[PDB]
C-alpha cells in the first residue's frame, strides 16, 4: 500500500553526469559513448558564430577527478555536442525521446557534474516543468527507464520569471515556445493534465480511498465541456483506452471516474483528501500508476 | 527557484541491492563489502509468523539454505549471523560497487530517500520522513522487504532504514541497519497498531520558510507568539510540540528570510485556524511536513 511520487532509479544516469566548463561558465553535461551533450548557452547570442570562434581546448570536461580531452565540437539546435577521446564505460542502453505534455519523467538535478537530487516531473501542457533548480543546474537531464534502457527526454536550459523551468529534448529542440536568449519570455497559462488526474484517482481506489466515487457516468463530450471550463485538458479516446487496465482492475469505467472528477471540480473536496492530498494530482500518468501498483523493476 | 520533494540520487544504493532467497521466501538484501543485510523474517515459515523464535530458526539454517543473487551472479554464502531483526549473510565476494557508507539511526521528523526494490531490483526512488509515531508512509508492495532508506552526505551513504513490514493501516515499519526497529513494533504477525500520527511542526515551519524563499508570502502575518502559546495551539491540531532545539535549528532560515521563528509560528497558528482559503503554498493545499530544516537549506 501507499502512493508516492516516485522517480526512476537514477544510477544509470549518474554514471553519465560530467562537468562542462567554457571560460567562466560551468554547467552539467551528459556523457554518452564518446560524446558529451550540454546546453549550447555554455559558450542576442549568435551561437553558430560563437561556436566557430571556439576551439576544443576552450572546453574543459571533467568526469569525476578525470579531465576528458575534447577532440571535436558541433551544435544540434540548442545542444552542444563535445566529442571526447574516451567513451563512457558506464554508458547504459539509451535512446533519445521527445515526450508530449502530460508525460512524466525523472529529473536528476546536478551541480558541477555531480548528481544532488532526483525528482519526478511532468511536462506541463504549457511545455514548462515545475522543477526545483538553482543556478548551475543547466544540463541536468530528464529521463525514463524502459526495461534496462534509459530514455533521455529532457535537458535543463533555463528558468522563466515565474519560477517554472524550460529546456530541450536531447536533440536540442526546446519544449514549448521558448528560446535560449536573454529576452522577455512567459509561459502560457497552465492547464491540468486530465488523464493523469484520472490515473491518480484510480491509484486512490486501489489504495482504499473510495469516498469520491459516485453512481454516475458521463459522455466524453459532456466531460470535456465541463473540464475545459475548469482549465483541464480535453480527454481523448486515446486517454480513455490507456486508462482501460485501471478501469478493469478497479471496476470503475473511465466515464464513471470522469463523473466523479466532474463532481470534484464543480464541488471540491469538502474538507476531505485523496491519497493525503487536498488537490487533484496530475503528475502521475496511467502507466506510472500501473507500474507503482504492480511493482515493475529496473 | 521551485520546491520539490527530492530524493537523493540512488545510484550508490542500487549497486548494493541483491535478492535473498530462503526456501520459498524471496526479499531484498543490502550487499556492503562481503556482508548482505536483510530482514531476519526471510527465515520464517508459514507456522513461524505469529511467534517465531528467530535464534532457534537461524541455528537450524545452514549457509546453503540462503541463495543470494546479485544481478545474474549467485553469491556464495559463507556465514550467517543475526543482529537484532536483521540477518547478516557473509559472502565470498566483496561488493565492488560498495560506496563510502555508515549506519545511522534517525529520529522522528528526519527525512530519507527510499529505494523500493523487488527481487533485488530497484524499481523506484522516493522521499520519506520517519513519522513521529515511528512509521513511514511508504509505497511498498509484498516483496519490497529489505528495501533501504538512506541519505547521502558528499560521497557517503548513510543507511538509516530497512523495510520489514506493513501495518494494518497501510503504513510501514522497519529497522535501522543494526536491526533495531523504529517504534514499538516487532517482526511477528501479532496484533500491532501505530500510535496516532502527528504533524512534524519543525518541518512545516521549515517548509513555510522555503515558501517565503520561493516568493510565497500570503500566509505571513504581523503577529509573533510565545513558544508555549504556539505549542498549546499546535497540539490542538495534532502537531508535535516545538522545542527550543527546533527554534535554534530554524535560525538560519529565520536569518535568511528576516522572519523570526516565533513570527513564522504565529503564521502557522493562523493557517491552522483559517485553513488555506482556496490558496496553495508551494503548489500544495496542505501543510507539508516531510522537508526538514536541513533539506530546505540544501535545496534552496
Ligand atoms: C555563467 C552564468 O551565470 N550562467 C547563467 C546564468 C543564468 C542563466 N539563466 C538565465 C538565462 C538567460 C538567457 C538564456 C538562458 Cl537559456 C538562460 C537560467 O535560467 C539558469 C537557471 C536554471 N535553472 C534555475 C535557475 C535559478 C536561478 C538562476 C538561474 C537558473 C543561465 N546561465
Ligand atoms: C510469502 C509472503 O506472502 N510473505 C510475507 C507476507 C506478509 C508479510 N508482511 C507481514 C509480516 C508478517 C510477519 C512478520 C513481519 Cl516482520 C511482517 C508484510 O508486511 C510484508 C509487506 C511489506 N511491505 C509492504 C506490503 C504490502 C502488502 C503486503 C505485505 C507487505 C511478510 N512476508
Ligand atoms: Cl496502461
Swiss-Prot record, chain B:
Annotated control of activity: Inhibited by pyridone-containing alpha-ketoamides compounds 13a and 13b. In turn, alpha-ketoamide 13b (tert-butyl (1-((S)-1-(((S)-4-(benzylamino)-3,4-dioxo-1-((S)-2-oxopyrrolidin-3-yl)butan-2-yl)amino)-3-cyclopropyl-1-oxopropan-2-yl)-2-oxo-1,2-dihydropyridin-3-yl)carbamate) inhibits SARS-CoV-2 replication in human lung cells. Inhibited ex vivo by michael acceptor inhibitor N3. Inhibited ex vivo by compound 11a and 11b.
Coiled coil (residue ranges): none
Domain of life: Viruses
Domain Peptidase C30 residues, every copy: 1-300
Cytoplasmic side stretches: 1-300
Subcellular location: Host cytoplasm; Host Golgi apparatus; Host nucleus
Active site feature: 41 (for 3cl-pro activity), 145 (nucleophile)
Effect of residue 132 to H: In strain: Omicron/BA.1, Omicron/BA.2, Omicron/BA.2.12.1, Omicron/BA.2.75, Omicron/BA.4, Omicron/BA.5, Omicron/BQ.1.1, Omicron/XBB.1.5, Omicron/EG.5.1
Catalytic activity: TSAVLQ-|-SGFRK-NH2 and SGVTFQ-|-GKFKK the two peptides corresponding to the two self-cleavage sites of the SARS 3C-like proteinase are the two most reactive peptide substrates. The enzyme exhibits a strong preference for substrates containing Gln at P1 position and Leu at P2 position
Record's subunit section: 3CL-PRO exists as monomer and homodimer. Only the homodimer shows catalytic activity. Interacts with host FBXO22; this interaction promotes the proteasomal degradation of nsp5.
Function description: Cleaves the C-terminus of replicase polyprotein at 11 sites. Recognizes substrates containing the core sequence [ILMVF]-Q-|-[SGACN]. Cleaves and inactivates human TRMT1, preventing tRNA guanine(26)-dimethylation of tRNAs. May cleave human NLRP1 in lung epithelial cells, thereby activating the NLRP1 inflammasome pathway. May cleave human GSDMD, triggering alternative GSDME-mediated epithelial cell death upon activation of the NLRP1 inflammasome, which may enhance the release interleukins 1B, 6, 16 and 18. Also able to bind an ADP-ribose-1''-phosphate (ADRP).
Official protein name in the record: 3C-like proteinase nsp5
Organism of origin: Severe acute respiratory syndrome coronavirus 2
